[PDB]
XYZ file of C-alpha atoms in Angstrom:
124
model
C 91.053 94.524 76.027
C 90.991 90.945 77.999
C 87.462 90.231 77.838
C 86.128 87.582 80.968
C 82.808 86.352 81.316
C 81.057 88.980 83.443
C 81.646 91.692 86.302
C 80.738 89.292 89.017
C 83.595 86.968 87.172
C 86.616 88.848 86.530
C 87.170 89.844 89.994
C 87.378 86.204 91.226
C 89.063 85.009 88.096
C 91.792 87.697 88.409
C 92.533 86.502 91.920
C 92.385 82.976 90.884
C 94.281 83.101 87.601
C 97.044 84.861 89.726
C 97.142 82.011 92.500
C 97.220 79.735 89.606
C 100.539 80.629 88.441
C 101.856 80.951 91.923
C 100.075 80.019 95.220
C 100.704 81.426 98.406
C 101.293 85.009 97.023
C 98.563 86.229 98.663
C 98.650 87.783 102.223
C 100.698 84.380 102.998
C 103.533 85.909 101.114
C 103.080 88.764 99.587
C 100.796 92.303 100.414
C 98.654 92.082 97.147
C 96.741 95.200 98.113
C 95.179 97.029 95.107
C 91.850 96.959 93.324
C 92.646 97.571 89.705
C 89.905 97.149 86.983
C 89.502 98.387 83.122
C 87.213 97.201 80.407
C 86.927 98.375 76.959
C 84.102 97.237 74.436
C 81.793 98.586 71.924
C 78.198 99.952 72.937
C 76.633 96.661 73.710
C 78.459 96.777 76.827
C 79.332 93.084 76.715
C 79.243 92.628 80.526
C 82.624 91.610 81.422
C 85.758 93.459 82.345
C 89.372 93.126 83.577
C 90.733 92.976 87.055
C 94.610 93.512 88.009
C 96.523 93.610 91.327
C 100.009 94.668 92.276
C 101.955 93.790 95.983
C 102.686 97.554 97.002
C 99.554 99.598 97.884
C 100.025 102.683 95.696
C 102.084 101.502 92.835
C 100.409 101.441 89.375
C 98.031 99.070 87.241
C 96.798 99.602 83.970
C 93.329 100.120 85.275
C 90.684 102.080 87.637
C 92.485 102.411 91.083
C 89.858 102.054 93.521
C 90.697 100.297 96.886
C 94.390 99.922 98.204
C 95.160 98.174 101.431
C 94.147 95.279 103.237
C 90.745 95.303 101.870
C 91.965 95.074 98.280
C 94.281 92.226 99.561
C 91.178 90.412 100.720
C 90.117 90.769 97.263
C 92.872 88.655 96.209
C 92.159 86.179 99.003
C 88.571 86.205 97.568
C 86.728 87.662 100.605
C 85.161 90.898 99.097
C 81.563 91.998 98.616
C 80.872 91.891 94.791
C 77.879 93.266 95.690
C 79.324 96.438 96.875
C 81.901 97.047 94.518
C 79.793 96.305 91.374
C 76.540 98.188 92.253
C 78.887 101.337 92.787
C 81.297 100.205 90.101
C 82.614 103.097 88.349
C 81.948 103.900 84.559
C 85.476 105.435 84.505
C 87.033 102.401 83.071
C 83.960 100.717 82.076
C 82.925 100.869 78.538
C 81.565 103.436 76.089
C 78.142 103.669 74.363
C 78.657 105.126 71.067
C 75.812 106.979 68.974
C 74.720 106.328 65.326
C 77.576 108.706 63.960
C 75.448 111.679 65.383
C 78.094 112.348 67.730
C 81.891 112.072 67.578
C 83.618 109.890 69.963
C 87.046 108.506 70.820
C 89.131 106.037 68.906
C 87.618 102.529 67.938
C 85.710 100.273 70.382
C 88.580 98.217 71.959
C 91.908 98.106 70.274
C 91.717 95.221 67.543
C 89.261 97.508 65.502
C 92.458 99.573 64.551
C 93.163 101.825 67.362
C 93.540 105.462 66.104
C 93.201 103.918 62.565
C 89.463 104.065 62.235
C 86.140 105.872 63.420
C 83.822 103.023 64.417
C 80.335 103.478 65.736
C 77.378 101.665 66.820
C 74.177 102.516 64.622
C 71.554 100.077 65.982
């Protein structure tokens, strides 16, 4: 539940913020091969999402594991086709569209809405 600006944004921001804390951790020093992304928001979809990386391909990120290897590392570098990954981006960790109470769905929209302490829908 770390909302960024947009789908196109978070990928560039995640690589950027990481380097912002420690420059050179890309293929220069660490083998950061991973593509991790997750986003939880209510029905409106609020086009944003979270992106994460780790430095050993095959480890675990708290997101949707898509790419692993030098291609995911180039994602850390910033050399990636967002037009490719976004247009075939998987709704697996993308957000959920509720109903008007007509259908029963998972716990609250994100987690600040209680998390297993409420049943919030989107009636609109």
